[PDB]
């Protein structure tokens, strides 16, 4: 009952414009959804009863998989639950599924749910969104319904292009920093049979610490992420300074 009235309030799923193929767009918000807090059902019928009255002709979706981690996944029995639930012509009608923002996490995601996902790998209808431009190339600018936190990510950053992510295998990456979060861009990586550039993002309000190693190397501590990255750039000096003065101006504005 009146639990239900809570979801339209979270609107992790909403319209919001046409397509330059004329068809209505919807947009899930991956983070907005936070599992084992609201009833799985519930979010499911919400979409479902968002995509009735259009779900027998043609539509697209946008999946804004900004920030999202752990604490927003679907879980094993919910997440085929999904492919279930619907009619089978309402999977059928959905013309395009731009993705964006996809992470590492959502990344690895996808690795354990392999075979719940088979279906999706190569599949020509996932439109994976290199970068906030590539959007237009499908929907008219005027038209990009974006929640405007995913949005303010995008505008006064300082990049480092040609860092280096430490791992067993180290990875090419770009280092943004922005007002209030670092976001750490990589080249193409796999999801899906895809090639994408995946997003990582680390808010100010995350960042627990950061050390400067060497001249050349840093490393950012996470919350709840437990091991450290590590960074190697020919800059770290001013990378680091800028990531501190980015924490520290969230510190100040805390209250209390």
């Known amino acids: 009952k009146e639990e239900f009235k809570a979801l339209k309030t979270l609107s992790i799923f909403y319209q919001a414009g046409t397509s330059k193929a004329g068809n209505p767009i919807f947009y899930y918000v991956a983070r907005r959804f936070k599992t084992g807090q609201i009833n799985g059902d519930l979010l ?27 604490s ?8 085929s639950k999904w492919f279930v639930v619907f009619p089978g012509f309402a999977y059928d009608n959905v013309s395009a599924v731009y993705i964006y923002n996809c992470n590492s996490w959502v990344r690895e995601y996808t ?8 279906g999706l790998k190569g599949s020509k209808r996932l439109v994976f969104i290199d970068c906030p431009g590539k959007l237009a190339e499908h929907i008219e600018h005027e038209q990009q319904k974006l929640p405007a936190a995913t949005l303010a990510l995008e505008e006064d950053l300082k990049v480092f292009h040609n ?26 990586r796999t999801v899906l049979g895809q090639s994408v550039f995946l997003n990582d993002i680390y808010y100010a309000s995350e960042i627990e610490e950061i050390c400067l190693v060497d001249e050349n190397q840093f490393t950012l501590t996470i919350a709840n992420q437990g091991t ?9 000096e001013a990378i ?17």
């Open 240 to 256: 680091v300074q800028s990531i501190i003065h980015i924490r520290t101006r969230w510190e100040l504005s805390q209250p209390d």
């Open 111 to 118: 690795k354990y749910h392999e075979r719940l996902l088979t």
């Open 44 to 70: 499911i019928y919400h979409v479902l009863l968002t995509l009735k009255p259009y779900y027998a002709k043609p539509y697209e979706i946008v999946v804004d998989l900004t920030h999202t981690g752990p």
């Open 163 to 188: 860092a280096l992510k430490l791992a067993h295998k180290d990875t090419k990456v770009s280092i943004k920093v922005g007002s209030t979060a670092v976001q750490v861009t990589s080249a193409e």
């Open 72 to 79: 927003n996944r679907f879980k094993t029995d919910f997440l």
């Open 228 to 236: 450290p990255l590590t960074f190697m750039h020919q800059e770290c």
